[PDB]
Design a protein around this nucleic acid. Structure first.
Lengths: 54, 114, 52, 152
RNA sequence: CGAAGGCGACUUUCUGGUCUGUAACUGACGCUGAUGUGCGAAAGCGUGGGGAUCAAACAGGAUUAGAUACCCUGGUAGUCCACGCCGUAAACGAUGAGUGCUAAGUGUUAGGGGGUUUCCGCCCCUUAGUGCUGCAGCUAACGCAUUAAGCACUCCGCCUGG
């Protein structure tokens, strides 16, 4: 699914205040778990948890 | 009026220049890369502020900066010893703020940090 | 953002190095500034999970 | 001459009088064809003038000179190409400048005649406490490559 | 993934479509080929920007026994995006697109059946592919091949001197 903003409870190891994702082999995941890692976390991680750049 | 001054250092890979300024923008003076015989962007050497920036800082004597806080926006060889002119007369190098911006990002581009 | 004290400045050769690289999204920082080519990196751009 | 390169060199042997080759290489500066008939005497009217003008023999006050001529520590650099790239370096007796025999202080023979008989006794004692004089043994092989800082 | 040129920031979209596990079901209802489908990258291409970067030109420098050139900031446009594209690339698969195999193997993205469930992992079946090799076949050889440069049923176009 598209895990929402507080839906990083067992995933804030992956979340960061300042920009750290774990890619595929970093968690040993396939192309659904890594994919939620890289897309579905972002609703919590990017919009008001990561200043990209100015 | 002591303990007030920042060596806000605009040092890239070259161009070891640093303003011996206040903690915020008022800009007293400097021994920068246009100050100790050089011009800048080939001064990848500390002698902007190897020795002769604390010449300026102690000719001022108003900072008394126990915290001189070189603030960088890039690399530089002479920048780690651009703070030797904050150790020469000994103004107690205490911080290294080597950061590029992360405010956020105006529009269909103007531009800002990478 | 970094304040390091208690170090010499002819020894600042070692103090100016160690707060740089640590970021898993070091790219998703950079976003909207300066964007480049993978040309020689097309040796390694069939790559993991970007969109395929 | 590459592909090939360069490898170390030769040296000298002492004498049964004092067990010293510092005097030997200095005679080998003058060792005419095996006929050292008074090249021996020219050496013994050169080398004796540091042991005579300075009271101590070849091993104490001459040591002020002959601790500092062909090396233990000299100036040298490595394969770095056409740049400055200079730093102090420890060395062996292969290529030679700062413990036994080499370059500057001690031209024994450089005064106002065209002689060898008395000229060697003339300009000899300047390496009493390793103080310059004229080009035979050390002085100027110590102070090479420590100049540029700002506009380097 | 797209008709291609090609397709890249991500929250999202249609998730269109791939996609494999189910496929719930009337009775040839398709490939190529009159139709017709669209564009195809740039050099260049019909408006503000554009000389801001880069950048030809010019400057200006000079190797060692040789420039204005490798050298380029000011800088000529151009570069570039909010209104028009050509039908060209090593778009090369030098290898056209339907029915199916060629001992087959191979580890694997997807989606599944699962055992064991693990501590989300070990083992078996799996295919669009993914690669790897590798049987037959292939041509002179290059070298191709369960996914052609083979094998038996479809069309297309090419040319049998250039």
């Amino acid at each position: 699914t598209h895990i929402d903003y507080k839906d990083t409870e067992l995933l804030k190891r992956f979340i960061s205040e300042r920009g750290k994702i774990l890619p595929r082999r970093v968690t040993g995941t396939s192309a659904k778990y890594q994919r939620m890692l890289t897309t579905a976390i972002k609703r919590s991680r990017h919009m008001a948890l990561l200043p990209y750049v100015k | 009026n002591i303990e007030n001054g920042v060596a806000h250092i605009r040092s890239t890979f070259n161009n070891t220049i640093v303003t011996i300024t206040d903690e915020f923008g008022n800009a007293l003076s400097w021994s920068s890369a246009g100050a100790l015989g050089f011009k800048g962007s080939k001064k990848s050497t500390p002698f902007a502020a190897q020795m002769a920036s604390e010449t300026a800082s102690k000719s001022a004597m108003e900072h008394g900066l126990k915290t001189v806080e070189v603030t960088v926006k890039g690399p530089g060889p002479g920048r780690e010893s651009a703070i030797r002119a904050l150790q020469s007369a000994g103004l107690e190098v205490t911080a290294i703020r080597d950061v590029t911006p992360v405010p956020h990002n105006g529009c269909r581009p103007p531009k800002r940090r990478r | 953002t970094v304040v390091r004290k208690n170090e010499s400045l002819e020894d600042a050769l070692r103090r100016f190095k160690r707060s740089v690289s640590k970021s898993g999204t070091i790219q998703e920082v950079r976003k909207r500034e300066f964007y480049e080519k993978p040309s020689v990196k097309r040796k390694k751009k069939s790559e993991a999970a970007r969109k395929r | 001459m590459p592909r090939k390169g360069s490898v170390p060199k030769r040296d000298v042997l002492p004498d049964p009088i004092h067990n010293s080759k510092l005097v030997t290489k200095l005679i080998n500066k003058i060792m005419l064809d095996g006929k050292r008939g008074t090249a021996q005497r020219i050496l013994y009217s050169a080398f004796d003038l540091v042991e005579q003008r300075s009271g101590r023999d070849a091993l104490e006050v001459f040591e002020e000179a002959i601790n500092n001529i062909m090396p233990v520590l000299e100036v040298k650099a490595r394969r770095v190409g056409g740049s400055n790239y200079q730093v102090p370096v420890e060395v062996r007796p292969e290529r030679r400048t700062t413990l036994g025999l080499r370059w500057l202080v001690n031209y024994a023979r450089l005064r106002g005649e065209k002689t060898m008989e008395d000229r060697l006794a003339n300009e000899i004692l300047d390496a009493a406490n390793n103080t310059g004089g004229a080009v035979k043994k050390r002085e100027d092989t110590h102070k090479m490559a420590e100049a540029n800082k700002a506009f380097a």
